[PDB]
Amino acid sequence: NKALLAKRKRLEMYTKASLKTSNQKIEHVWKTQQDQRQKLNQEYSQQFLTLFQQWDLDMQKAEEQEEKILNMFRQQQKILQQSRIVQSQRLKTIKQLYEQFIKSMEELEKNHDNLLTGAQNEFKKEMAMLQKKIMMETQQQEI
Amino acid sequence: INKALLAKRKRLEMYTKASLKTSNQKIEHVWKTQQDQRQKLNQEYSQQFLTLFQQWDLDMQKAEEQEEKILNMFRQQQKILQQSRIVQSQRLKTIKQLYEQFIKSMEELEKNHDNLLTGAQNEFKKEMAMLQKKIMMETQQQEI
Amino acid sequence: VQNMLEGVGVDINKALLAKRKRLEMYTKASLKTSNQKIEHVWKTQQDQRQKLNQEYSQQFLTLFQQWDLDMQKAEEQEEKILNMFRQQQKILQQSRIVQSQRLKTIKQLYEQFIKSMEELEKNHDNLLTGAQNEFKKEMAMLQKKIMMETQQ
Amino acid sequence: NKALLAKRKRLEMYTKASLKTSNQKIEHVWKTQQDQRQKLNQEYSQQFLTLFQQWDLDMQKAEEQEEKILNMFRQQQKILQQSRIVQSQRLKTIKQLYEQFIKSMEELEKNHDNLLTGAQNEFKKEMAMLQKKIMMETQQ
């Protein structure tokens, strides 16, 4: 009976050990599956993170280049506006110079008119004197 | 005799006066003609220059209007370029957030599943232990 | 008497075989059931992971479809910007050609004006010469008349 | 009659000289006035020539600057275009990576199904051996 109980205890210990091992092997299958699902998620998350980081950097570069264009345009828009302003001033200058030219010609005409009248009056006196000389030197004297 | 001589003299003097008056008037008409032609020429060109200046002023008014349209067009194009960048950044944020939500939902599901699996595994262990205990008790030699 | 104990032994071995067969049948059935229950937990978990994937895939598909449509609209906007610019670029280059012509026109009219004044001066020189010569013929005729008539 | 002809010739010579002198003095007034009109034209022509030259140069620079703005616009139309192309590629890349991810998870599910089946079958063999051992040893 001591032998009987020793045999029973031996079989019970072996059963306990066998169940423990068989269950642990199944537990390792769950852990493997879980490891592989997490590994797959980590691999794709790294790839998505790389894409999102590259996209964010490209948007930062695009913002930087917009700033460069705005500055370039600001400068060129000022030069273009000034070149139009100068042309409008040029038109005003030519119109004013033309009016000045016409006015100078009118002032000169008035001066010339008065000088010509004086010269014409002298010419008339000279011609009258010439005819008076001819008349007096040819005319028959009174008897 | 002297009355006749003086009448002849008076006649010649009147003719001389009339001739000088006419000859001088003809020269005076040359001055007036020259003056007329110079003024006519100035008036003709002034009218032409005025037409050109008026047309030029209107064309400068149109050129300023069109210059404003093309600069506005560039500024409007910049608005489109800037907006498309802003929308892209929003899109990136939306996709990034949806991806993080997906990963988080999978992690939450894993935690729920872990607890459910532990419970099921414990029941399985009890059933296997019960099965082996049944085999042992039904086969074993009884105490004497 | 020994034959009896031996005959008892056969009935013992028959009983032993029957007991073993019964336990083997029960074990087979129990392992099958216990494994099936675990398999169902696995299938449930797998169903819920697939359901989650299907739900997110639908949401990602919506985002990608909306993005594709927005790129089609952006291509439409880009085409209108070009077309409005092409029209405006033509009007602007035409304006600049006209103002170039205006400078040429004014420069030519100015040169024509100066040349006309020079030509008029030359014509006026001939009108004065002609008038002075006519005056010189009239004075000679007048003197001839006075001379001839004062001798009479 | 010799005296009469001498007198006439003297008066004719004087008249010719007087008309010549009087006309020359008027001609000089005319030439002076003409000189002053010609001088005035030359002064203004110099000023107009300067303005026209400067205007021509300013129109050359205005043409070049307009060209720069039109060029700047054309360069941005290319950037807005290359923005649309890069976006479409980016969308394609993300969409493909997402589909790959979903497909990989489906493939993993199928592999995991086989790992569980295999483990369950090994477990069944282990329990059968264990029962056989208990049975054989409880009789001996």
Residue numbers in the entry:
A (entry chain E): 82 to 224
B (entry chain F): 81 to 224
C (entry chain G): 70 to 221
D (entry chain H): 82 to 221
What does the article say, verbatim?
We determine that SYCP3 is a tetrameric protein and that its helical core folds in an elongated rod-like structure spanning 20 nm in length. We conclude that concurrent DNA-binding and higher order assembly by SYCP3 on meiotic chromosomes lead to compaction and organisation of the chromosome axis, in a manner conducive to SC central region assembly, recombination and crossover formation.
We thus identified a core region of human SYCP3, corresponding to amino acids 66–230 (SYCP3Core), that is highly stable and can be purified in large quantities to near homogeneity. The crystals contain two tetramers in the asymmetric unit; the tetramers are almost identical both between and within iodide derivative and native structures. The helical chains of the SYCP3 tetramer are arranged in an alternating anti-parallel fashion, such that each end of the tetramer contains two N-termini and two C-termini. The SYCP3 structure undergoes a left-handed 90° rotation along its length so that the two N-termini at each end of the tetramer lie in orthogonal planes. The two halves of the structure (hereafter referred to as arms) are formed of a four-helix bundle leading into a coiled-coil that zips together the C-terminal parallel chains, leaving the N-terminal ends to splay apart. The most prominent structural feature driving the tetrameric assembly of SYCP3 chains is the presence of two four-helix bundles, one in each arm of the tetramer. The centre of the SYCP3 tetramer is intrinsically asymmetrical as parallel chains B and D interact in a coiled-coil, keeping chains A and C apart by steric exclusion.
